[PDB]
Amino acid sequence: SDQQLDCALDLMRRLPPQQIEKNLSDLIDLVPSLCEDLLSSVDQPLKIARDKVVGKDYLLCDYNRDGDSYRSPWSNKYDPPLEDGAMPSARLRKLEVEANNAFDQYRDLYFEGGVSSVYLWDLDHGFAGVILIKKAGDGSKKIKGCWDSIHVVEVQEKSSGRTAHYKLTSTVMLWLQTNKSGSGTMNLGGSLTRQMEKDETVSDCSPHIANIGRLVEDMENKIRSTLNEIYFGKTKDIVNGLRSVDVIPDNPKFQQLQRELSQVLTQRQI
Amino acid sequence: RVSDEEKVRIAAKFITHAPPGEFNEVFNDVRLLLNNDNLLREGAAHAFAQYNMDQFTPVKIEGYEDQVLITEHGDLGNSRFLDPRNKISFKFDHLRKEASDPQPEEVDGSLKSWRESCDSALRAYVKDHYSNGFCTVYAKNIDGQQTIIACIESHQFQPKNFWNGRWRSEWKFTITPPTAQVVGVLKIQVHYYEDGNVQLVSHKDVQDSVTVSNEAQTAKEFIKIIEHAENEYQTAISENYQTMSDTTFKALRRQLPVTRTKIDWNKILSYKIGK
Amino acid sequence: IANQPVVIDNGSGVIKAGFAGDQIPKYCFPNYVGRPKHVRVMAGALEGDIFIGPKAEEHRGLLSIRYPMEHGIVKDWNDMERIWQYVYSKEQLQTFSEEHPVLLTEAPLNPRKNRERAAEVFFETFNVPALFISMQAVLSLYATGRTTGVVLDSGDGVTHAVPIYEGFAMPHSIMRIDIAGRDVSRFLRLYLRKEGYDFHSSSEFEIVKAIKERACYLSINPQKDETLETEKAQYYLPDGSTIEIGPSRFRAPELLFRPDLIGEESEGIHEVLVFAIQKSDMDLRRTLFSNIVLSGGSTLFKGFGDRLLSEVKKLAPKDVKIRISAPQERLYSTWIGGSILASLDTFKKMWVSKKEYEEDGARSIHRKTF
């Protein structure tokens, strides 16, 4: 059954990432014994939650959730209301409020839409956060699309010197639909994950969350540019290489260029 | 406890919609998942039939020296498929890679003879579009109507590279004098799975009206329609996405902010907005 | 008509020219058209009123300098025609355009309309017998004597990392930016105004290029240089007045690695180099890492190659042998390769003849290049 989990993860890596929720539910139907293993291991699109007391949307993960209920980052309360939920420390809660506010301004500048959520769970040696974002594209347009963040960070605070070992694990779950130009409609689904670790000295001017943020900004600019290329580097060579009309006239030229390069090869040496 | 009938339906959805580079692996993944073989092996055999028809993939029959695509138009109905070029029936085994034990077929083929001249032409143009290209031009009567059904594909699979590009083309040409009617769908699929996944999924539905004149003309007219459509398609598929995806993917999330300055974290944590 | 062919290596900053089968380009001069600002009162003044090359360099202060070509894309076509006419004229080459075949160069992945209009100029206005446009990276490898390897380059207009493996220039793996020496010179000019010493004039713009060429260095750790206070070194201008440069000298060439500082989204030189290696096939990546060739003027900063090596070590997979090689004459790397390519007997087959252009048109030029 360890091979079954390996196959289950291999299957979700090959099926469309647009239908993770439906396929994961069916995969749990087919293997009910792996339900707990698959829900933890298989990454899926983030759920929308609504805080009724504040009147604001928050996002749901395994880390912020304790049992059936999920701590809202705005009110600090779980829905449904649990008696003794796993809350953070009063210092970490104040830090968590400042994280939410900081990453609220983060998202709103990069996307200018959607919803985010930030939750920080208390550790003895550190403070570890999750930064969720979900932005939806223009619904009226034929081109649908969304962008989803799952930045999990682990900060190991050192005792002396005020330095902090950060460990960022960032997933980016994308699905671009393209229905335009009167030539057909294409739907592209991406899912790259990148890891980054760093030790930064703590400043009194800028808190530790700002140090975390700097990793997110740099990671997102790089992951995005990496993603961007893995799209083209494959959608270009593979599709063009299959059905290129200019392949057959250039093949005759390449064969001429093969004689030519061979003549160049001898002449370059001497 | 999930019922045995529920297990087969879950297996069917994955096998019916699997990426063709790894679909035979997906079947192996479904089989390596559920313990017993017979329940999936029996259910997959039906799925493979429907699945291998929608791929337009050719099984090489041992002694033909060419590749005959398989579809709904070649389906005789008795688990054997037509090869309209070489004009022999073949039984296609769906688990195993090969199709063997063929049977010579003989039909009057009056509608079928006309299109086989147009077919042998199409091939030469398929060879022009792709480095490796295989086809099948089915000849059939559909509820009294007279219809050529050319199909083209391309399979480019490599295990080490982790990328797989696959083309399938569906083309139906109904013969009616003078004016004829055409219906065709054109699907691309590419999949990259290194350090995480990326998929290209596509199609173009085209409705066209053609007029029959000569055998040389009808052979070179339909091909011309395909040539221009598939180029315009690839052109748009390559040239729009390299630029427009970059801008639409950017319209969702921008590479830098509206200021074009990396956001200052010190600014965020000690500034107030509004009124 | 197979005379000794001419190699006009184009470029936004500098334009090289000369004959085939030569060691160095004899005719190098900056690619711009100087025109007189002031009113010519006195008789017996500078005649012509359109200055190109060494006359324009000699008489900077009179002339309002303007560049015809930005980011490997000509804006003013009349200016480039005058430059090409000056190249062929008696003041530089001492030849006719009708005699010799032409080898042109351009940056990769440019607009095709500019390539067509370039060919129109060579075939119609000049009466060229045969034309051939080529890549810069392909030539630079022919100059060195290798076939395999990536070519990172940095001129005044374009920075592009082209991977090649045994005479197979992958058109798809070519990365490119519109960020280069001109943008670094513009960013240094902006920093000098923040320091105090403002330069706004077009003749005065070339003093900023001269300061950028001479007094600049790329630090390995930029955060460490930001924390430390600079020494504020001096430099004498063409006039005589001294200028304390300050922290502008080291923060100016950071634009190439951090493109966010000017205010435009791009990858960067070090990212582009990693990105060109990644887009190619898995088996060819380790050979591409081992052979990395440098070229252009904006690779000549102090500690540039050392910073590139550190950036590759950070991004690339671990336990891989990195080697960023470079020639002695980095400025004339592309032209030497063209002179070698032109001297070869194969060159006759590749070119676009004037008869072939008159028959077909632009389609034949698009086919022969790729």
Ligand SMILES: Nc1ncnc2c1ncn2[C@@H]1O[C@H](COP(=O)(O)OP(=O)(O)O)[C@@H](O)[C@H]1O
């Ligand atoms: N020693 C140097 N240090 C820094 N920058 C230089 C140096 N020499 C030249 N440059 C810059 O590089 C440019 C010349 O590059 P070049 O490769 O000739 O451009 P192109 O590729 O367009 O011909 C000049 O415009 C100048 O700004």
